[PDB]
Design a protein around this ligand. Structure first.
Ligand SMILES: Cc1ccc([C@H]2C[C@@H]2COc2cc(NCc3nnc(C)s3)nc(C)n2)nc1
Ligand SMILES: [Mg+2]
Ligand SMILES: [Zn+2]
Length: 320
């Protein structure tokens, strides 16, 4: 789908309220209440991370409005999820600016905006177990490969390629930065990645100059951004969780119509077990992630602090 003439023109003429400028720098920033400003917020973030001449303003505004039109109206993995994940990446980048190159900053902001592109509200297991065409095309990381394929297709639209002004080597480097960042958002790969990084940090062998290490660090940054709803203020973290489960329970509903027993996280009859399962996700997934990200990039400590606050909140729910 391509953005209409009206859409990209509209955000070229957008102006961000100076009250927001101070707020958007904080890790806990919730975008939720500013729906009309989401595309323009992405523009400001790109222009503050990689400068006013980062990309052609027309091309960038067309790209952004076409990415919005290709996210589906599903409960969680929607346009709103994309800007939230891109905002968290901007906050990480701003706080560690000279650790990343211009090309990495450009790639990661665009990778986050496009990372769940064209999501059907179905997990990789649903598509693989029910022999969906996408699973025959992509054996592993099924949706994550499709999201990359879709990202490349928006760049192949008339006047959308924000990267063509890069040298041929810079272009292939950015397209590989994006492919790897998007694949790292498949939570199945996260556990292995975090284990290796924890190992390299403890032993003292982690070296950001080593491209293999750099790729794993970027991957952990993408996970942290993907799950950042656990780093928001408790009321926000709570309302987002209702959206996550609205999408998980809708997948389990499709399995129940096909005579299939879903796991408890995708079963709406198992709502009571959500506080306990959220506690488990914080203990095994969220806390380790932000703990390792803070060890590597100490300015990202507020993410570990906020995640720890919501862990204490989920424990409070469980206790009564
Ligand atoms: C009964 C029971 C058992 C276990 C669980 C917990 C594992 C789930 C909690 O999963 C998540 C996933 C997630 N982000 C990735 C996503 N993938 N697809 C989406 C849709 S959200 N972010 C958060 C805050 N929580 N819940 C209930
Ligand atoms: Mg995803
Ligand atoms: Zn995501």
């Amino acid at each position: 789908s391509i953005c209409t003439s009206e859409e990209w023109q509209g955000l070229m003429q957008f102006t961000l309220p100076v009250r927001l400028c101070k707020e958007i720098e904080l890790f806990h920033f919730d975008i939720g209440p500013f729906e009309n400003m989401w595309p323009g917020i992405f523009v400001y973030m790109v222009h503050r991370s990689c400068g006013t001449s980062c990309f052609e303003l027309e091309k960038l505004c067309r790209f952004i409005m076409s990415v919005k039109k290709n996210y589906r109206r599903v409960p969680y993995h929607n346009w709103k999820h994309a800007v939230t994940v891109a905002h968290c990446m901007y906050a990480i980048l701003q706080n560690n600016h000279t650790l990343f190159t211009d090309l990495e900053r450009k790639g990661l902001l665009i990778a986050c905006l496009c990372h769940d592109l064209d999501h059907r509200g179905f997990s990789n297991s649903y598509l693989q177990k029910f022999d969906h065409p996408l699973a025959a095309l992509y054996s592993t990381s099924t949706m994550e490969q499709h999201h990359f394929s879709q990202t490349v297709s928006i760049l192949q639209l008339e006047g959308h390629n924000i990267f063509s002004t890069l040298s041929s080597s810079e272009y292939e480097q950015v397209l590989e930065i994006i492919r790897k960042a998007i694949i790292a958002t498949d939570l199945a790969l996260y556990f292995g990645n975090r284990k290796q990084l924890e190992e390299m940090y403890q032993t003292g062998s982690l070296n950001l100059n080593n491209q293999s290490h750099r790729d794993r660090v970027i991957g952990l940054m993408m996970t942290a951004c993907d799950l950042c709803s656990v780093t928001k203020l408790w009321p926000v973290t709570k309302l987002t969780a209702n959206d996550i489960y609205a999408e998980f329970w809708a997948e389990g509903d499709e399995m129940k119509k096909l005579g299939i027993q879903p796991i408890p996280m995708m079963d709406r009859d198992k709502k009571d077990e959500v506080p306990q399962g959220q506690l488990g996700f914080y203990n095994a997934v969220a806390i380790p992630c932000y703990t390792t990200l803070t060890q590597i990039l100490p300015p990202t400590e507020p993410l570990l602090k906020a995640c720890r606050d919501n862990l204490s909140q989920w424990e409070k729910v469980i206790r009564g």
